[PDB]
Symmetry: D2
């Protein structure tokens, strides 16, 4: 057997809740699982992706374990993909949870590759703080102002800094354009 | 706008957890909701609960129409956008009309309940709800016997499977019930309403 | 193994295209399938046709049990793993037991059909099928009026909305039928089975 | 409004058929659409030409929906194009392979998953065991094409089949984690 399930979406979408839901199902059938977290739900804390494999090799590991949970994958590096693929190759079901976007609206750490490797994708939505539509993005605010493109990706926090928004209501001051004709197109279309 | 979302599946699937998850989302955007529950026993219950941690307030109601009465009453918050209805299986067919009407009048209605009774047949009014729901989420549990995705609730009294003709309604948890796949759902004395069905099962046991 | 997949939605949603798509997949792995169709729908004769891609042959059958008879007959290829059934809404309740039995005996059964009749009510036996289906795909069309996701089929005779009491079965296409959202589905003389429904609709029209 | 829908999966999964089905729906409501395709529908040499075409006189102003088929052959510039399209009121429906023969992200598609509002990952049927197939497998003379072979190679059943995870095998697959091969050994022990 063996496969990867990916639970994702912006902040305030209930990712962790959904992970917990899926894990709680296993208990009624007495199926053992183990959850990892990068350095509340109960979980082994870990410094880097490879340490997961070492822990499973260690004496701490219960041999009956069928399922491996990984929460907040966005804080790992690319090494997590190979770890998750290998675990799935060797009969483990791996359920993974994390943000798909950083505050810029860009792929958060290694998650982009994870979508490719996941057998099952669940992209959850939050509710837009501005208009109430389905929210796909996390927005960061610093004293009421939309955070700048060049600010730090990693910044731990809650509603003090962050809200969930739709596409339309996600704005990043000073976002660059990689395609020469992009700004031209936006101009062209503001003409109506 | 206005629509119906249906969360369903067997027992031990996390239906209530999923309902709570969707309603919790609304709070971070300050969007108001109201949850209803059919009155099952004598206990007054005022929260639905997910073992995920969260609990949300619920109004108890003795029939589907009372939901509309409550929304017309003074207790109703005008800002309410979303109506949650848990354990719909215990309502009668009147719940469909209620839910449709709510959706027609701009409410988002999120509905949770069992699709099957212990016989593996449509539980109360839920069959029609599938039709009316804009969005269907059929969750699974884990089969107690083989670990496959479970689609069925199985009832056992003193270790023996429930007979087909037992009472549909019987409140309880793992002392009576488990979740199972199709293959591991067996109901002693299951009828066949097709004259050729038994014949076909015979024919196929031959190989 | 064995399971039921249900493809559903209003008219103009691409249900038959999606059924065909799933069966086409099986051919690249050389997995055999067999497709059934009720007789009343005279739009395609002994084949299943999307207004696209291609079409593929199907056996015509008047009632559900005939499906099992055919599988027991000499005409049946023993290699067949998958049974497709299109336009289920025209069968009666016996189709559910047939589909359950097929899944119990190792067949994958892929089923397509309308969830609503023109009244916006459960079409024939489909309501129970939602319960028995392991997997549900409710597809949408595009609303003829507003371009929203369409969930309903609207029937019109000479531009006039069909009355609630008209005949359920009426074969045809865009001459009679369109796809609409909830808000744009209107049926003259729709009854209310709940004593407080019309009261609620009045109360809410007040704002 | 504006959003991205992404249809993906291995070869033989019906991706194009599903794209076509979604496009057909629009015709019954008279909603106009336009489809693009890369130079291996309007044919195009690179992602930005899409935007240029929409700016040109060839473009019908009533167009609400933009279809993009086999995105895997575009470069990363396609993401920015698709995002920009969605920000300016277009519904963009995108179809392509998620994996190259290696079982690794095909061209730009990995970013697309992140940007798509809606993801539909289709499966094919494993040519080997009949399970859900998630991978495209390449064989020449019945041999599993080596990890180091060319990514781009046009063709059909002559070279390619659809397989589940277990039946996807790449000779000489590297391991970027120092403890990987160790772990695979450890578990071979049972
Ligand atoms: C968007 C963003 C979030 N973060 C941080 C802030 C939070 O501490 C953390 C988000 O944790 P999450 O669990 O993803 O946030 P959440 O609890 O609202 O989501 P859920 O309920 O669905 O589980 O990541 C960054 O560091 N940088 C960023 O750009
Ligand atoms: C299957 C079945 C259940 N019941 C009762 C037993 C329980 O009291 C109730 C089931 O409640 P549920 O909330 O569906 O059970 P659950 O908490 O395990 O489900 P979930 O986690 O997915 O939310 O219905 C019957 O009365 N008759 C039946 O045939
Ligand atoms: C709504 C309705 C339809 N019909 C008939 C009209 C058509 O013959 C048939 C609908 O068949 P469908 O195949 O469901 O219509 P369609 O071809 O547009 O479906 P799709 O594109 O999604 O594959 O049902 C009734 O007899 N009574 C009704 O109330
Ligand atoms: C896996 C793989 C495919 N290809 C090529 C071979 C094919 O010509 C093309 C894939 O065919 P497609 O037409 O993109 O997909 P498909 O038609 O087989 O399946 P569907 O019906 O779902 O649309 O891409 C590569 O060039 N490199 C690769 O690594
Ligand atoms: Mg519950
Ligand atoms: Mg059809
Ligand atoms: Zn918004
Ligand atoms: Zn089982
Ligand atoms: Zn409409
Ligand atoms: Zn396989």
């Amino acid at each position: 057997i063996g496969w990867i399930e990916f639970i994702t979406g912006p902040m305030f979408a209930g990712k962790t809740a959904e992970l917990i839901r899926r894990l709680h199902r296993l208990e009624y059938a007495d199926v053992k699982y183990l959850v990892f977290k990068p350095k509340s739900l109960p979980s082994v804390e870990v410094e880097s992706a490879p340490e997961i494999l070492n822990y499973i090799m260690s004496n701490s590991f219960n041999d009956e374990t069928k399922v491996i949970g990984i929460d907040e994958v966005q804080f790992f590096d690319d090494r997590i993909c190979e770890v998750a693929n290998i675990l799935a190759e060797n009969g483990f079901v791996v359920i993974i949870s994390g943000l798909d976007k950083n505050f810029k609206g860009e792929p958060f750490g290694p998650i982009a590759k994870l979508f490719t490797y996941a057998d099952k994708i669940t992209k959850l939505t939050a509710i837009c703080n501005e208009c109430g539509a389905e929210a796909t993005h996390s927005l960061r605010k610093i004293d009421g102002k939309h955070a700048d493109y060049n600010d730090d990706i990693v910044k731990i926090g809650c509603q003090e800094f962050y809200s969930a928004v739709c596409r339309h209501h996600h704005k990043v001051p000073n976002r660059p354009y990689l395609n020469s004709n992009s700004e031209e197109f936006i101009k062209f279309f503001k003409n109506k």
